[PDB]
């Protein structure tokens, strides 16, 4: 029974999963946190953190490989999948990693300096430790490459796009792609004749319009700062307002970039938490700013769901996914009730059901548009691409 090793290298951690090729089931999962710091530890399935002390990306991947060996599945690793943050314009699909690909990843790495260079460090490590294993790169931007110029061009001077490559790229592509495929089965839709809106709500929040199997619009921009308001991210923000704050408080562009990424969003408005479970409980206890943060969060999602619907000839489905989208009974209902204009009617018995019920339809019968919850599986989608590319001569 061969397996796929899925690796996601962040700036501060390394997340990994081992999926069984036969059933696409998770056999092992873990996180190597506190990366590049003075203290680095490795937890597997939450099985008590084991430290390495001042360890790098290569040493951490070697520790995971040693734990991979302790369970006798090292020689069973047939494929290695790498999650890549930014693929620029060069990558439209998942590819088998070669010297050419690496060079191309380094080319578009300036577009995401924090995340993309960390991905390359993971590629270099896995190459060193598993050279006779086929390795695959899956890009978080590639799905959105089917966008037309009108959908990705910014109203900036053309030169920024042609010379520097300033345009909408969009993220959560792997998730949007996975959820799309599942929606055609759950809603019983013909891919070649369909219009979906996928709402990935969780860590980061993004919307995607999927027309006839292709991504036609997405809420995130060149960076994950554009679009929906998030946990700590501001979302859509007037540049004039940002320029006004820079003059009135005397802050640098770096200072405001810190504020927008880490001090804003749900955390910013409420002044309490970035976690939704905390804010839901706070509002339940009569916290006004927690109510406002959630109400604003809901509003901007509804605004973008209806907004992205314009890039469709016909609206068949709205799919909720991600940590928030799969679990929050409240957020789903408030968003759908905010979208009464589109002729949606919700089934509250179905919307009450917890995530254990998996891929479920939550809209009632008289509804013009089918509303559904589909749990996203980014690890399975990476594995599926890897399995497909595992049958290929390179």
Ligand X SMILES: Nc1ncnc2c1ncn2[C@@H]1O[C@H](COP(=O)(O)O)[C@@H](O)[C@H]1O
Residue 83 vs 167, nearer CB to a copy of itself: 167
Smallest separation, CB 333 to ligand X (Å): 12
| CA-wise closest residue to 137 among 162, 113, 102, 169 | 102
- Min. distance of Cβ 331 from ligand X in angstroms? 7
- 257 appears as a binding residue in the annotation: no
To the question of whether residue 360 is assigned a binding role by annotation, the answer is no
10 and 85 Cβ atoms separated by less than 8 Å: no
Contact stretch for a copy of itself (CB under 8 A) within 97-105, 145-153, 324-332, 371-379? 145-153
Any binding-site annotation on 203?
Answer: yes
Contacts with ligand X by CB under 6 A lie at: 202-203, 231, 275-277, 322-324, 327-328
Residue 321 contacts which entry, a copy of itself, ligand X, none (Cβ below 5-8 A, type-dependent): none
Neighbouring residues of 230: CB distance < 8 A, sequence distance ≥ 6 = 203, 204, 205, 265, 266
Q: Is 36 annotated as a binding residue?
A: no
| Residue 3 in tokens | 């397996």
- The binding track of 153-172 with respect to a copy of itself, each residue x by CB under 8 A or -, is xxxxxx-x---x-x-x----
> Taking CB under 8 A as the rule, does residue 28 contact a copy of itself?
no
Quick one: which of 292, 330, 350, 361 contacts a copy of itself (CB under 8 A)?
292
Beta strands in 282-382 (DSSP E): 317-321, 360-361, 370-373
Catalytic status, residue 140: yes
CB atoms within 10 A of CB 138: 27
Catalytic residue among 75, 103, 140, 236: 140
Smallest gap from Cβ 221 to ligand X, in A, equals 20
165 annotated binding-site participant: no
Q: How far is the CB of 227 from a copy of itself (least distance, A)?
A: 9
Q: Which long-range contacts (CB under 8 A, 24 or more apart) does 96-105 make?
A: 96/134, 96/135, 96/136, 96/389, 96/392, 96/394, 97/123, 97/127, 97/135, 97/136, 97/137, 98/394, 101/137, 105/137
Give residue 191's Cα distance to chain centre.
Answer: 22
């Amino acid at each position: 029974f061969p397996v796929v090793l899925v690796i996601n290298c962040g700036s501060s951690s390394i997340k990994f999963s081992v999926l069984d090729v036969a059933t696409c089931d998770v056999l092992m999962a873990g996180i190597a946190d506190g990366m590049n710091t003075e203290n680095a530890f490795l937890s597997i399935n939450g099985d008590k953190p084991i430290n390495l002390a001042h360890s790098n990306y290569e040493d951490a991947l070697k520790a995971i490989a040693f734990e991979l060996e302790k369970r006798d599945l090292t020689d069973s690793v047939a494929l290695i999948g790498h999650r890549i943050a930014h693929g620029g314009e060069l990558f439209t699909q998942s590819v088998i990693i070669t010297d050419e690909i690496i060079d191309n990843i380094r080319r578009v790495s300036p577009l995401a300096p924090l995340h993309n260079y960390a991905n390359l460090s993971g590629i270099d490590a896995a190459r060193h430790l598993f050279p006779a294993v086929r390795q695959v790169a899956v890009f978080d931007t590639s799905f959105h490459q089917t966008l037309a110029p009108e959908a990705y061009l910014y109203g900036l001077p053309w030169e920024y796009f042609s010379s520097l490559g300033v345009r909408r790229y969009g993220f959560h592509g792997t998730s949007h792609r996975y959820v799309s495929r599942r929606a055609y089965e759950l809603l019983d839709l013909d891919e070649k004749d369909s219009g979906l809106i996928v709402a990935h709500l969780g860590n980061g929040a993004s919307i995607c319009a999927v027309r006839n199997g292709q991504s036609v619009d997405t809420s995130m921009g060149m960076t994950p700062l554009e679009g929906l308001m998030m946990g700590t991210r501001s979302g859509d923000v007037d540049f004039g307002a940002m320029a006004w704050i820079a003059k009135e408080t005397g802050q640098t562009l770096s200072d405001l970039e810190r504020v927008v990424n880490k001090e804003s969003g749900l955390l910013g408005i409420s002044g309490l938490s970035s976690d939704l479970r905390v804010l839901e409980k706070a509002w339940h206890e009569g916290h006004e700013r927690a109510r406002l943060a959630i109400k604003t969060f809901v509003h901007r999602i509804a605004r973008h769901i209806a907004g992205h619907a314009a890039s469709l000839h016909r609206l068949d489905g709205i799919i909720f996914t991600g940590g928030i989208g799969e679990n929050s009974v409240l957020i789903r209902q408030l968003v759908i009730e905010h979208l009464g204009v589109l002729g949606l009617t919700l089934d509250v018995e179905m919307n009450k059901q917890p995530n254990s019920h998996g891929e479920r339809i939550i809209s009632a019968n008289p509804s013009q548009v089918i509303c559904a919850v589909i749990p996203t599986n980014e690890e399975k989608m990476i594995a599926l691409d890897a399995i497909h590319l595992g049958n290929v001569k390179a």
